[PDB]
Amino acid sequence: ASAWPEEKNYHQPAILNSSALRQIAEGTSISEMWQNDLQPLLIERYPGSPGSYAARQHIMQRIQRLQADWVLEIDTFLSQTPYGYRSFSNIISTLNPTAKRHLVLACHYDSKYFSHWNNRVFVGATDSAVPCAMMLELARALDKKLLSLDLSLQLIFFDGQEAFLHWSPQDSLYGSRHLAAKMASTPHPPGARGTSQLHGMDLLVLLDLIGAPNPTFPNFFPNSARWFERLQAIEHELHELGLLKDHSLEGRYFQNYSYGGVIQDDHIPFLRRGVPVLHLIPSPFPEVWHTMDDNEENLDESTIDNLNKILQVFVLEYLHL
Numbered sequence: 001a002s003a004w005p006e007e008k009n010y011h012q013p014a015i016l017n018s019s020a021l022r023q024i025a026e027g028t029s030i031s032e033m034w035q036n037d038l039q040p041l042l043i044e045r046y047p048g049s050p051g052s053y054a055a056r057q058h059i060m061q062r063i064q065r066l067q068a069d070w071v072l073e074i075d076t077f078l079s080q081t082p083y084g085y086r087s088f089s090n091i092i093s094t095l096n097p098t099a100k101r102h103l104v105l106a107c108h109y110d111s112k113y114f115s116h117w118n119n120r121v122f123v124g125a126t127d128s129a130v131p132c133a134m135m136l137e138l139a140r141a142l143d144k145k146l147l148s149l150d151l152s153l154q155l156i157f158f159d160g161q162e163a164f165l166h167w168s169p170q171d172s173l174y175g176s177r178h179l180a181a182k183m184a185s186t187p188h189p190p191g192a193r194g195t196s197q198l199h200g201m202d203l204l205v206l207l208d209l210i211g212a213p214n215p216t217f218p219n220f221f222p223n224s225a226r227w228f229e230r231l232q233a234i235e236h237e238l239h240e241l242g243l244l245k246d247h248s249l250e251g252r253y254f255q256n257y258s259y260g261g262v263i264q265d266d267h268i269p270f271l272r273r274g275v276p277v278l279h280l281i282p283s284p285f286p287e288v289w290h291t292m293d294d295n296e297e298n299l300d301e302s303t304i305d306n307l308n309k310i311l312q313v314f315v316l317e318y319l320h321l
């Protein structure tokens with residue numbers, strides 16, 4: 001039996017030199033992302049709504065225009081909810097579908113349901129319109145390098161992350177609970193006898209609640225800590241080369257501390273099935289968490305810009321591009 005599923009345990013990154021780093025920093029455009037990827041997503045988009053459909057089309061359209069050979073799949077399913085049976089649609093974008101191993105970046109594109117209050121609508125700017133846009137900007141910014149692509153890249157935009165009422169084991173993580181179970185029972189690579197698509201998940205990098213000022217991301221798991229350190233190293237180098245905006249080491253995003261317990265998110269259904277996770281959610285959460293103020297006005301542009309550069313470098317180094 002092949003031990004390829006163990007390759008992830010020994011995988012090392014291909015570190016970019018100073019020259020390559022300035023190039024990545026110059027390759028991403030925060031204003032471009034803002035107008036073309038984020039704003040169309042700042043709409044009410046709870047599951048089943050017109051917005052959900054519009055968001056899903058935007059994400060697909062934005063990926064299809066790229067040169068990289070992206071394969072888009074809409075994973076639609078039914079699930080019981082506090083309001084009865086409903087339909088959900090996860091969006092999966094994969095480069096090299098048969099590539100045994102894949103680095104996976106993810107977030108949820110649905111927005112928590114709230115009945116209109118004082119003519120205000122909840123759009124979950126940091127939760128998680130920004131993460132969505134960041135993934136799209138990354139796809140755009142590294143498009144040329146990704147075009148050259150047994151390890152590849154995959155993006156997952158989960159639907160139904162939010163609870164329709166208040167968090168509950170049965171009410172929340174609809175999309176991820178469904179996709180995890182599905183991938184866990186789908187042979188991979190095609191024709192495989194005893195390995196699943198989950199065996200193929202090298203690492204799940206989940207972005208959530210990003211876009212607020214001064215985020216502090218803690219290290220959550222020992223089996224992905226070496227990767228958390230890479231993010232620290234990248235942030236440090238990008239900073240020393242003066243490639244970050246209004247950024248200080250004292251107030252850096254990736255600090256030297258782990259988090260005791262765990263935070264409920266889309267990674268749970270995967271983590272509980274053995275998938276290594278790098279959970280990029282800040283602790284504490286943005287002040288605007290689940291408030292009508294989690295809007296565009298309260299987003300920190302330079303912070304998102306800095307994070308884009310960091311994430312993009314991490315991905316290129318992980319994929320040896």
Ligand SMILES: CC(C)(C)OC(=O)[C@@H](N)CCC(N)=O
Pocket residue numbers: 127161162163167172173208209263264265
């Ligand atoms: C629905 C649940 C509670 C699972 O997740 C969220 O609200 C995430 N937006 C943020 C993560 C969190 N646990 O607050």
Ligand SMILES: [Zn+2]
Pocket residue numbers: 112127162290
């Ligand atoms: Zn939320």
